[PDB]
Design an enzyme around this catalytic site. Structure first.
Site, PDB file in Angstrom:
ATOM      1  N   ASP B  21      40.405  -7.960 -69.386  1.00 35.05           N
ATOM      2  CA  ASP B  21      39.134  -7.687 -70.050  1.00 35.05           C
ATOM      3  C   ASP B  21      38.514  -8.946 -70.639  1.00 35.05           C
ATOM      4  O   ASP B  21      37.389  -8.906 -71.152  1.00 35.05           O
ATOM      5  CB  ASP B  21      39.319  -6.644 -71.150  1.00 35.05           C
ATOM      6  N   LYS B  24      39.293 -11.310 -66.999  1.00 34.18           N
ATOM      7  CA  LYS B  24      40.370 -11.136 -66.033  1.00 34.18           C
ATOM      8  C   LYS B  24      40.065  -9.968 -65.106  1.00 34.18           C
ATOM      9  O   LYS B  24      39.910 -10.144 -63.894  1.00 34.18           O
ATOM     10  CB  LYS B  24      41.697 -10.915 -66.760  1.00 34.18           C
ATOM     11  N   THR B  25      39.968  -8.763 -65.670  1.00 31.09           N
ATOM     12  CA  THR B  25      39.553  -7.609 -64.882  1.00 31.09           C
ATOM     13  C   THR B  25      38.205  -7.856 -64.223  1.00 31.09           C
ATOM     14  O   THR B  25      37.999  -7.518 -63.050  1.00 31.09           O
ATOM     15  CB  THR B  25      39.487  -6.368 -65.770  1.00 31.09           C
ATOM     16  N   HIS B  84      49.485  -5.092 -72.207  1.00 30.45           N
ATOM     17  CA  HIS B  84      49.024  -4.291 -73.338  1.00 30.45           C
ATOM     18  C   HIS B  84      50.204  -3.630 -74.038  1.00 30.45           C
ATOM     19  O   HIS B  84      51.311  -3.596 -73.490  1.00 30.45           O
ATOM     20  CB  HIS B  84      48.009  -3.240 -72.859  1.00 30.45           C
TER      21      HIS B  84
END
Lengths: 67, 393, 77, 203, 80
Positions: B21, B24-25, B84
């Site tokens: 996020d 990266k994503t 995460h």
RNA sequence: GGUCUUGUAGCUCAGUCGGUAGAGCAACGGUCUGAAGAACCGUGUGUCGGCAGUUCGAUUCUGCCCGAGACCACCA
RNA sequence: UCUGAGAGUUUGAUCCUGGCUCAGGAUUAACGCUGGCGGCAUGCCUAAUACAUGCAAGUCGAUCGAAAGUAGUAAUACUUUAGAGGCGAACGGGUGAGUAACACGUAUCCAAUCUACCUUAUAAUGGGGGAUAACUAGUUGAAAGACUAGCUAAUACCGCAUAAGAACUUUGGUUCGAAUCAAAGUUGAAAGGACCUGCAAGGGUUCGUUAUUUGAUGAGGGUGCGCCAUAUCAGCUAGUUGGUGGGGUAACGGCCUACCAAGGCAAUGACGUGUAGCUAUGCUGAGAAGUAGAAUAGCCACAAUGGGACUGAGACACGGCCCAUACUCCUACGGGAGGCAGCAGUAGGGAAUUUUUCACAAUGAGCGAAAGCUUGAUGGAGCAAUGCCGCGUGAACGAUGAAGGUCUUUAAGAUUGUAAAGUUCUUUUAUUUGGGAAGAAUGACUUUAGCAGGUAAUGGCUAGAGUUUGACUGUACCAUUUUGAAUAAGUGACGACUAACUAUGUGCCAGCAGUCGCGGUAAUACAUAGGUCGCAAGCGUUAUCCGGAUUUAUUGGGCGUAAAGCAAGCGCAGGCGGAUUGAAAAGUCUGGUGUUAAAGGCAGCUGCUUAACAGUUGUAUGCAUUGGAAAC
């Protein structure tokens, strides 16, 4: 799996039973206790063999043993 | 045809480090976005990160996403591995089976302890010569700050020993790359031009029997159960006699289908991401952490002897060392196995350093491959990572 | 489906519209004779049902049945 | 089961010789104590009609080696015809291949014979074999195979095996025949028909 | 086919050329095993012409032995 | 793959602004017993699920995992 | 000639009634336990639950317009049919939910039934016309689709003609709820193609067409018959029963309408109830029979539910159409799709149930002149110890006997155990190398010749050739073909019932536990160790159908004391009837007639190296008939 509840025999020396677990029944009549009619197998769907039944391996879940 | 996926270039299982996020994503999205504009086997992504209920809106993902994005120059098994709370298992164990690793750093979102853990482990298993890209340059003022962030990310990598100033930091905005500016297209193009250099494509021979790190499973409508993962060695071929290895008893089976991410493969060679419909199986029969193999091969195991050098606390150990009743998790390519602790003689607790020769049994029969540079962590901190040494039961 | 129950409908729908028109053009003749009980309408309906009994549109079985029942009536004189 | 593996053991219990007598003669004072760990002085007190028919079945088959279902289907095959079929079936039993090979003066061993038939080194009427369960007619020819017609093992076996007068063989040719329908007198006077023949209706 | 697999067999039968075989049949006419085509024919050949005089259509298979019956050379009198 | 929940003496379970191992049955010396009940106290065992800080301490606060008990992710 | 075995089990002990258990096979079997092959066969009990995909019925320009396109300069040749039009679409596979019935089966009639398509027999193929799908334009909305119009084909639609015949009315004549026929009237066929021929005219062939007219076939119906439990089910029934008038089917039928009568059924059991596809058949028994109607075959049904309707030869149609809908799904929100009881395949469930497998080779079904083409029919192949068969896991030599278990506890002696070691040898298979199947000797197709009206040959009949058909196959099968004892037993039980004992431990605990029954501290009944005894790639478990169980007794049981003669009597019906006469002759049996399927039984054999089997030949039951009989 039907709504019927029955008594049955803990097979042999000991147990591998977890009190609310599923397994398979078994034939056999016991003339030591009256009104009782049924047996139930070990080493099946939760349980783990008749241990060291080193002369018998059928229906126990006790595999063909290694030497 | 099922759009049988063509291979016209050696495939590489790549991955990504940093944290999601941060771009990266959105890098995983934008690199594809610009791709189908000028690339084959290279479709465009905007929001196709996801294929699961409840995973869309949250903006922070539980599961990893295996996809295929190629170019005229390199194809990639691009895996969106989350790092995460409870989800870093997704990224951690991924670092092994991603044959490459692109560090994504944001010109908006700072390096996280996620990036630190990622680089730590990437060195610990051993992968040389990373590349890093500065993401999210969509906000201005990046001419000179990209120097101080460059020195600190090179400091970040030099905590473990990858290439330093020889690796370059390509700058770029995933937002102005997702949108499509050609000068900004040139940013991801320099990303590419500095990726294919200083990153190779590992050629894994197609003749070893088989092995697969299992990633996901699906029981497709009306044909049965397909199981996806990363091929480690050799080909997977017609009706192949296979046995599901690791953590369980041994099952022989025959295939009933194959794809690379819903795209069929004519030959699932070594290093491929194969999803095999099988002859009569179920997803419940196969979890994350399992293995497969062509039989006549590695068999499940519990006990072993492990010559290992232990990560010091500075390398991310536990705030205090670990005893023998200890119960860590050894990182076997697909799984984190809780195992016993019998350190070698002359070690009761493995203090910082301490290249030990521990011996350990595991709770389930896992197919053990010698030399497998597997890792060990506990509590959220890394203490062990190295190759397998001595095969026991 | 099939190639040839679909085009079967496509072909026969109109032919059956034609059947409806024709068989009505004879049911009206039936009525007329029920008023016009005479050799004229007899021959008229004879000639006409000739087309259909020859075809499947009438059967010689049912054609003969009806015409015989009707000539029985007209035999009243 | 296919192969026994030890036969003198069976005699120990049965007190019988597959040969005339020479199954147990002297191996340093041959001693036919029944096998196991339970008897030296212990003499017969558990014989039963059930048990005697058991024993007779054994003695018969233990000399002839006939497994369960094949023996039963032999019985059943012969059931279909009509007559005093007892001697008939017994002859048929002898017309088993390994039986005839043993009785041909060519197999000194039915264990030889059946092994050899199952390898099929014997050349017959327009066809070879690998199965030791064919049946013969009075006057059926049998020949060896050049493969084995030189083997010193074979040459001594053909030199001497069990022989019937109602079979013949030109050793000069090594070729013989199940000549004629033999007689019961030409057969071991030990076994009982009545028991087994009444025993076999179980299915 | 009948008989054990790797050994087919077919009795030769008069049956409608529209309803399944092993269904209801017209008549049975001997049997020739299609395994060896040398001869196994034991047919009546009378009820066949009985059928034929009032209408029948065989299969191409039968035209072989029909040539071996020269069935034309006898049913032409009917068409004569 | 994590989580919702289970881990205590022999079983199960208790765990003063943490203080230990505490309740029921097992359990058997001694009472009885046509014989042995039922019935009377005995007993005793206790690393409190396995690892990591920790105050006159981490079994209780927690971190991690294991597995027993429920869910979130095939799959528009 | 067939053809039937019993063991025990109530006491102090006996006898006897009785049960009870045991001792067998059978399976779609499933479990454990392990598991070589080769063959043979089979493989969702469940939810007629849900279901991606493909497949599971198409054919036909030589039926055509047109379309499109090709070669050719063009002319034309040539191609492909989206469209028309015809046949196949009611075949088939699944499923048996379901039903207590004319269902099934059987006998039967159909004076009351239909049967497109062959076969029988011919009468022929005369005159037009109108038409559009297509194509086109435009509308229409994302789609679903829809809508308007410009132009056409045909053997595609309506009349015109004739109409052998035929169908009818009508008078007459025929005959044992009918026909044959004489006489009047009514009324009706199509279409062209190709191919040959001939300048043409015209013919001829042939595709096709129209009618009569056979057959043949089915379909439909009817019926006796026989085809579950249920009397802790006795009154039942209103097109209902009967009659007309009419509709009316394919046809007979209140089958239906009106109309007119009140009737019809019953304990020799209605109604009611639970269950249900059936039949041949399948296993067990000596059989009657039980037992089931695995698999398969033939009758019937059913296609998601509940309705419709055309269609034709046929549906209210399992891959038809429409309706209300279940419910999933799609949509934009305006609208729709769907129905695996076709195939595999999946999900659910279960204890569980093979491959999302290849072939048109062959059979076949279809359509197609012809090629053809299909064909989740068909044949295959594959999983499975699911069954069955065949067959492994070496042959001989080889010991006062290896070690060593084990005991005795004696220190022996034995067992283990020719089993061993050790040699000679052995190669189906493990394992080489290659040869190398038929199945295709069908069938098209072109020639060849001969045949035949037609001669004017085409075209139609017989024989030869080869074009050529294969998933199987490569395999099958074979090759003193290599190496190589190599490549291979687990399983149960051992107190009696009923085969199979030594040791330990242990002591009514643990536990064995088909029956009698063993454990409360020296266990041939627990467990293990050894041995014995059992079968064997199987072995045991469990289930059930039956044997034994004649354990309801027509066969083949009784009713004093082991239940068992109701208190008795009257008592209709019923059951049960003295004798010699006659007739009839039902049964009764015989004799003959056809039927009662296949399959399978049984028996004969061919091929199965022996096999299982497959075939092969017949066999029998009864029904229905003909013919007697006189015995009852």
């Amino acid at each position: 799996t039907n709504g019927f509840e029955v008594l049955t025999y803990i097979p042999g020396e000991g147990h591998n039973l977890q009190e609310h677990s599923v397994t398979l029944l078994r034939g056999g009549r016991v003339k030591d206790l009256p009104g009782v009619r049924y047996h139930i197998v070990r080493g099946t769907l939760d349980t783990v063999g008749v241990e060291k039944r080193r002369q018998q391996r059928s229906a126990y879940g006790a595999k063909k043993p290694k030497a | 045809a099922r759009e049988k996926f063509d291979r016209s270039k050696p495939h590489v299982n790549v991955g990504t480090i940093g944290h999601i996020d941060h771009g990266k994503t959105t890098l995983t999205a934008a690199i594809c976005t610009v791709l189908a504009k000028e690339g084959k086997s290279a479709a465009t992504r905007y929001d196709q990160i996801d294929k699961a209920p409840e995973e869309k809106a949250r903006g922070i993902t539980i599961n990893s996403a295996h996809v295929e994005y190629s170019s005229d120059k390199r194809h990639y098994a691009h895996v969106d591995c989350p790092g995460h709370a409870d989800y870093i298992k997704n990224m951690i164990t991924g670092a092994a089976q991603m044959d490459g690793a692109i560090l994504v750093v944001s010109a908006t979102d700072s390096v996280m302890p996620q990036t630190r853990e990622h680089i730590l482990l990437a060195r610990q298993v051993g992968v040389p010569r990373m590349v890093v890209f500065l993401n999210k340059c969509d906000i201005a003022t990046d001419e000179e700050v990209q120097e101080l962030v460059a020195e600190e990310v090179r400091d970040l990598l030099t905590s473990y020993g990858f290439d330093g100033k020889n690796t370059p930091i390509i700058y770029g905005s995933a937002l102005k790359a997702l949108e499509g500016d050609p000068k900004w297209e040139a940013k991801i193009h320099d990303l590419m031009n500095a990726v294919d250099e200083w990153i190779p494509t590992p050629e894994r021979e197609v003749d070893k029997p088989f092995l697969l790190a299992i990633e996901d499973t699906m029981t497709i409508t009306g044909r049965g159960t397909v199981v996806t993962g990363r091929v480690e060695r050799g080909e997977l071929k017609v009706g192949q006699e296979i046995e599901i290895v690791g953590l369980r008893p041994i099952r022989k089976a025959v295939v009933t289908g194959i794809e690379m991410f819903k795209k069929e493969l004519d030959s699932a060679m070594a290093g491929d991401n194969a999803g095999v419909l099988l002859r009569g199986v179920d997803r419940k029969e196969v979890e994350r952490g399992q293995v497969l193999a062509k039989p006549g091969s590695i068999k499940p195991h519990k006990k072993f002897k492990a010559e290992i050098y232990a990560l010091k606390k500075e390398e991310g150990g536990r705030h205090t060392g670990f005893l023998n009743g200890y119960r860590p998790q050894f990182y076997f390519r697909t799984t984190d196995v809780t195992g016993s602790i019998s350190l070698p003689e002359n070690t009761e607790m493995v203090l910082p350093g301490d290249n030990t020769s521990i011996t350990v049994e595991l709770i389930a029969p896992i197919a053990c491959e010698k030399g497998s540079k597997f890792s060990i962590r506990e509590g959220g901190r890394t203490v062990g990572a190295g190759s397998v040494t001595e095969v026991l039961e | 489906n099939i190639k040839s129950n679909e085009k079967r409908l496509r072909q026969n729908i109109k032919r059956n519209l034609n059947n409806k028109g024709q068989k009505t053009k004879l049911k009206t003749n039936v009525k007329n004779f029920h008023k016009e009980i005479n050799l004229d309408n007899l021959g008229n309906v004879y000639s006409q049902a000739d087309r259909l009994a020859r075809k499947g549109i009438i059967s010689t079985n049912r054609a003969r049945r009806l015409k015989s029942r009707n000539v029985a009536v007209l035999n009243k004189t | 089961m296919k192969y026994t593996g030890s036969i003198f053991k069976r005699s120990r219990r049965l007190g019988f010789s597959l040969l005339e007598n020479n199954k147990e003669f002297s191996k340093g004072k041959k001693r036919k104590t029944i096998p196991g760990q339970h008897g030296n002085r212990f003499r017969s007190s558990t014989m039963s009609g059930y048990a005697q028919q058991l024993q007779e079945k054994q003695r018969m088959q233990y000399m002839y080696g006939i497994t369960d279902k094949q023996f039963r289907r032999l019985f059943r095959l012969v059931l279909k015809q009509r007559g005093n079929l007892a001697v008939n079936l017994f002859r048929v039993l002898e017309s088993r291949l390994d039986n005839i090979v043993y009785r041909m003066g060519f197999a000194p061993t039915r264990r030889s014979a059946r092994q050899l038939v199952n390898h099929g080194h014997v050349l017959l009427n327009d066809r070879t074999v690998d199965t030791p369960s064919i049946i013969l007619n009075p006057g059926d020819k049998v020949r060896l195979k050049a493969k084995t017609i030189k083997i010193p093992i074979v040459k001594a076996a053909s030199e001497s095996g069990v022989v019937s007068p109602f079979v013949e063989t030109n050793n000069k040719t090594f070729e013989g025949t199940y000549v004629r329908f033999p007689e019961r007198s030409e057969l071991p006077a030990g076994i009982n028909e009545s028991y087994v023949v009444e025993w076999y209706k179980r299915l | 086919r009948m008989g054990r697999v790797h050994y087919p067999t077919y009795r030769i039968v008069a049956v409608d050329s529209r309803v399944k075989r092993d269904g209801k049949y017209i008549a049975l006419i001997g049997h020739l095993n299609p395994a060896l085509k040398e001869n196994k024919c034991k047919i009546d050949e009378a009820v066949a012409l009985e059928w034929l005089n009032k209408g029948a259509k065989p299969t191409d298979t039968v035209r072989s032995l029909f040539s071996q019956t020269g069935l034309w050379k006898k049913f032409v009198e009917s068409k004569k």
